[PDB]
Design a protein around this ligand. Structure first.
Ligand SMILES: Cc1cc(=O)oc2c(CN(C)C)c(O)ccc12
Length: 282
């Protein structure tokens, strides 16, 4: 079926939970043996969210190459994304090592450091220009260059230096700051505006390594971001845009990381975002 009318048909019939459970039943199951080794317990935020072995990002290190991060490679859309958990106190250096090694331009953050009165990820970037951060375990230096605070999101320019080689690179930090503590946003308008700002920066383009996107577990809000982006790109590429099937795209993405889209409300919000976004594109 088309999307907008499939949408109203699920609303009128109140069957979002049944649709979402079907997705959960059909989703791929691949091994994640490296994630579960005992030496990696303090590298995982949640025991039930792990990267598959076949698609995990490897750190360029011989001691321990493990990080909780996955490469989502979308062949028809010609887009790639790295989806990862919010960094932990003992993985902030690994996080920036990955950004460096994978040649990423942009980092997309969809959570606040504290939500619901608890810490959802480490404070992993500097907040003042004159107070830079040094990650001694991976030999990197990170400096805040500029910050632009808007009503729904903040964009930061950061400098990442590899202290071994003295090479430097400019990284863009795109921080969506207004996702509610509970539920999903009422309108997709600010989320779509944010997606378009990431696109306009070059961070999603083939001349750079894959964008790094995270929330707390790296599957819920993060899944909504890449699902909406890929569906809108396919609607631009194909002769028949009504052929784009958001459930099929989501199942393809779940071949590369488990659990993408965590609730039926997130599924409905993803439909809403693609529907409204397709009208603005034209
Ligand atoms: C992919 C890759 C390229 C590279 O330059 O080096 C690697 C190393 C070691 N060097 C010193 C970083 C690894 O241990 C693991 C992977 C790589």
């Amino acid at each position: 079926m088309e999307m907008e009318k499939e949408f109203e048909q699920i609303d009128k019939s109140g069957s979002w939970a049944a649709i979402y459970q079907d997705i959960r039943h059909e989703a791929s199951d691949f091994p994640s043996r490296v994630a579960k080794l005992p030496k990696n317990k303090n590298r995982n935020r949640y025991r039930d969210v792990s990267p598959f072995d076949h698609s995990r990002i490897k750190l360029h290190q011989e001691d321990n190459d493990y990080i909780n991060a996955s490469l989502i490679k979308m062949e028809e859309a010609q887009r790639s994304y790295i989806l990862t958990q919010g960094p932990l106190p003992n993985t902030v250096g690994h996080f920036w090592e990955m950004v460096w090694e994978q040649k990423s331009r942009g980092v997309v953050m969809l959570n606040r450091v504290m939500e619901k009165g608890s810490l959802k990820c480490a404070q992993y970037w500097p907040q003042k220009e004159e107070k830079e951060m040094i990650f001694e375990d991976t030999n990197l230096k990170l400096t805040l260059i500029s910050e632009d605070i808007k009503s729904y999101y903040t964009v930061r320019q950061l400098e990442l230096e590899n202290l071994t080689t003295q090479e430097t690179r400019e990284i863009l930090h795109f921080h969506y700051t207004t996702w509610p503590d509970f539920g999903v946003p009422e309108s997709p308008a600010s989320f779509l505006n944010f997606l378009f700002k990431v696109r306009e920066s070059g961070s999603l383009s083939p001349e750079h390594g894959p964008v790094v996107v995270h929330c707390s577990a790296g599957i819920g809000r993060s899944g909504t971001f890449c699902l909406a982006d890929t569906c809108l790109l396919l609607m631009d590429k194909r002769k028949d845009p009504s052929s784009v099937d958001i459930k099929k795209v989501l199942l393809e993405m779940r071949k590369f990381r488990m659990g993408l889209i965590q609730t039926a409300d997130q599924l409905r919000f993803s439909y809403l975002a693609v529907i409204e976004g397709a009208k603005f594109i034209m």
